[PDB]
Amino acid sequence: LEDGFTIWLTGPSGAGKSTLAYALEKKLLEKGFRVEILDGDVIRNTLYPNIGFSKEAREMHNRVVIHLAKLLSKNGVITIVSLISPYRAVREYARKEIQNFMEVYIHSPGVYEEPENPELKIESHKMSIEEEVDTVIRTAQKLGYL
Amino acid sequence: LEDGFTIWLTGPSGAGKSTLAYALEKKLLEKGFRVEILDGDVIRNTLYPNIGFSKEAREMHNRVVIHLAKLLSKNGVITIVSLISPYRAVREYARKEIQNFMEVYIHSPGVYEEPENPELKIESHKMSIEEEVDTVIRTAQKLGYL
Ligand SMILES: [Cl-]
Ligand SMILES: [Cl-]
């Protein structure tokens, strides 16, 4: 891929973000792409499991994940981020840092802060995982990322 | 590059690590490669400038830098690391984590801990920066990384 990009998953708890993230990785790998999944809880457990949940710790973790996605996306990798957070602030920061950025909002009918204008909105637990994956990939194609 | 790799600079303060790191980046970009430089102090200042200098904070920063290098190198990026530290422990951990790992020791005649068997040993200030860059690239070629 001449240009990598980030697929940033967001939605309330239970919407299916984690499942979709890993299914996207499996499919895009099968297709021959360079792909990495940045699962927030995995990264935390691997790099600083005892950092705590203070504000400063939460924003450091956010900056680390975002920087990991920025470097991976600018070097031709498809970066799938599943970073647990209800807040828009981290997602707006991520979009400012990562040039090629595709936000996937899984909508279910702190309080979850909805995005303004995500690249893709999917209704939770309606379509099969395969259809969710195909919908994300078609959006990436429409955006010129794939 | 079907396979990326890490160039890990080590040596005592003043040996010329930083100068070689940035010259290597400039040369490899001009050759058309995907390259990232992971400058330890730049990464600390960007991602967590107020983390402090405790043992836990030092080890967290080391793990972050190494994980960045690991993910970039496995995805076709030449990762040039210049992480200030006199200690072998971080370098041995990095080598265990990063499959394609090329250690470049700039030797100068809290105390610096020499590596056992680095892929390349350069005598500090003995050759021009251009010749140091060329020697690193030739070593990478000998190892089959380039
Ligand atoms: Cl495709
Ligand atoms: Cl070359």
Author numbering:
A (entry chain A), B (entry chain B): 16 to 124, 153 to 189
Kindly provide excerpts from the paper associated with this entry.
Here we use physiological, biochemical and structural analyses to provide a snapshot of the complete sulfate reduction pathway of this methanogenic archaeon. M. thermolithotrophicus activates SO42− by conventional ATPS and APSK, but transforms it further by uncanonical enzymes.
(1b) Alternatively, APS can be further phosphorylated to 3′-phosphoadenosine 5′-phosphosulfate (PAPS) by the APS kinase (APSK). The APS-kinase model from M. thermolithotrophicus, MtAPSK, was refined to 1.77 Å. MtAPSK forms a homodimer with an organization very similar to bacterial enzymes, which was expected due to its high sequence conservation. The N terminus and region 125–152 (the latter being involved in substrate binding) could not be modelled due to the lack of electron density. However, the residues binding the substrates and Mg2+ are conserved, suggesting that MtAPSK should be functional, as confirmed by the coupled enzyme assay.
